[model samples]
Target: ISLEDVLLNGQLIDFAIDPSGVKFLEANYPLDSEDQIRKAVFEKFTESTTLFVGLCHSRNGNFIVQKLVELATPAEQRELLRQMIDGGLLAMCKDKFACRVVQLALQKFDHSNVFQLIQELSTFDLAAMCTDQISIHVIQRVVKQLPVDMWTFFVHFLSSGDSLMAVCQDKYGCRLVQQVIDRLAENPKLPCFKFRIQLLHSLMTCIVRNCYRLSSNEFANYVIQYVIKSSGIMEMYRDTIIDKCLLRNLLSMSQDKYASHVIEGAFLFAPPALLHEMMEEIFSVKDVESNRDALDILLFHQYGNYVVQQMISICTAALIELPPAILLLYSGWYEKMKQRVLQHASRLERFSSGKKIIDSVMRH
Candidate 1:
């Protein structure tokens, strides 16, 4: 009944060869101590170290490797990691089964070991990994587990030349970009605030500098909106996004198929002063051809109607809590929109998109 009996009889490998072997290990792994039983089994497993990578790619065997990786001491962790990644870092990371083990390695290895592994992966390989479906998970784990200070090579690769844009526009790569920026945008009270803030500023400057094309891209727009949402609590970020990115061609972005989503993010998260300025532009601007105002054009537009609906809901909600002075400014602002919407209610109620707009306005 004891696991020691199996190992004492030279049965650990055979015991592990069965798919159900992992359940046995999982059940007993957490209860292991530095006792001779665990020591003996650990030695036996590492003795056949060549099997580590083979097991890592096994659907059943991969889980076993993950368990060992988790149960390993620092020295054992380095040994297992070395054998697993020896010349197969990229290949292992791209394996559906093996990638999980690699992700765990990034989590469990000593910092120096992890750094050495990352250093060995060239910037070009690392960038290419960001766009790979399976390997991107490996890169994200590195970002999630490692300190931001160690992100210099990867960050520089992304921020320089066209690599940042390339990743931002990739299906898998965009999530990596999102993960990196999410870290950059989070808590500033950590000991590394200086470096993080500098990283954030450089990345933000890069993203916003090329905001138009990115905001209108099918995949990249999410990155732009992520910047808007993640930095919602910070005025500096909101101002940068608004002043540098959205303000230049606010109406054009609001009507765009993809860029319209960014405007919705802006309306949902922009500060009160910026929101007021945005609404004023939406109200006061007129079309070059039809003489229809921005608000009217948006109310009837296919994609822009969603932006209008977001604007209406945000403005109406804010009017309830606005201070007296701001209330005086907003009360009439809401009233004007209400009157315009009701005047067009008959036309708005007739179509699917229009019906949605009418319902949002009527909710007030």
Candidate 2:
């Protein structure tokens, strides 16, 4: 019947008290008009105890809230729901309810207001009531939607010494970092590495644990460029600058079949001297897999014929110290690479003038 009928007959109070009654009401209620349902629930339950109201809402309140949030105009939705979220209504929600509310809110609300709410919640202590996944989902939604200005705000949360970053880092921080980098790649006008060093540093701390997932080809290129530009590898670390974090990050990115381009980009941008040093370091490691990776990256850059030949020599020397089976594998790879280099040199001849061809073959 009507909300007035239920209130006058004390059925509203009965439903609020009886755990199953709310479910019954939900089953019977015409939820298509979510605004009407929400208004009716709020009007009947405003005088009830907070515990009862929460329970009543827990049973069917989230459905009405979500529909109301969805039906609201963006501005009205932001003003009304963000206030509730800021006031801790979210903390009272069950896990499923909280997740639904945040997900709906992200779809319906204004980006600035949503970002503000995220920033506010990131600072608050919600004690045992906080739903970490819901919070992260909301933040992820906001960043994906408004990558420019809002991302700066979101990144600030990670550096704010709050537990939000810790939770994200523990769960899906690498994914979030990859998202951030993708956004940066699309829009360089956003905060560059200078303003994001804290976030970058935090990601570095989680490298050993999360490195495997963090490395996508796009992410690898982003990390290499970011380190080269922001960390000043040439000026600061020079030959000594072995960022295991970056190396591991690159390795992670290379697992993809198409990630060869990322490796090429890294070597192309690398200082020649640094590239040689890194090649030497990779050779010294003596890990077959690692050596293959090093070779792949070097090949992508078309490192001079002499350098490629030298790499083959280095691998051969290392093989002398290994088992015969392993040595055979290395020798096979070496010969194949040598043939590939010869093919590449012949291909380059098609694009060169006679003088250019003579200079290329004789110069180095």
Task: Tell me, by lDDT, which candidate is best.
Answer: 1
> What are the runs in model 2 whose C-alpha is more than 4 Å off?
1-42, 45-60, 73-96, 111-116, 125-134, 159-169, 187-282, 285-364
Model 1 steric clash pairs: none
TM-score of each: 0.89, 0.45
Worst lDDT run of 10 residues, candidate 1, spans: 230-239
Q: For model 2, how does the per-residue alpha-carbon lDDT over 1-364 read when each residue is reduced to its tens digit?
A: 5655665686765664455655655554444445665456544543344533354246455564454456565545654554465446545333555466666666676766666655655555432222254444555565666545555645554445543334433443434545554444443344554544445455444432333333333343344334334323122321222344334444434335433333434444445445554444444233466554444444343323233444455544555445787566556655655555455565445533322432432433
Give all candidates' CA lDDT scores.
Answer: 0.78, 0.47
The number of clashing residue pairs in model 1 is 0
Clash number by candidate, in order: 0, 0
Q: With candidate 1 superimposed using the best TM-score fit, by how many Å does residue 108's alpha carbon deviate from the native?
A: 1.6
lDDT of 1 by residue, 246-309 (tens): 9757778988999999999988888777888888888874667878988888888888888887
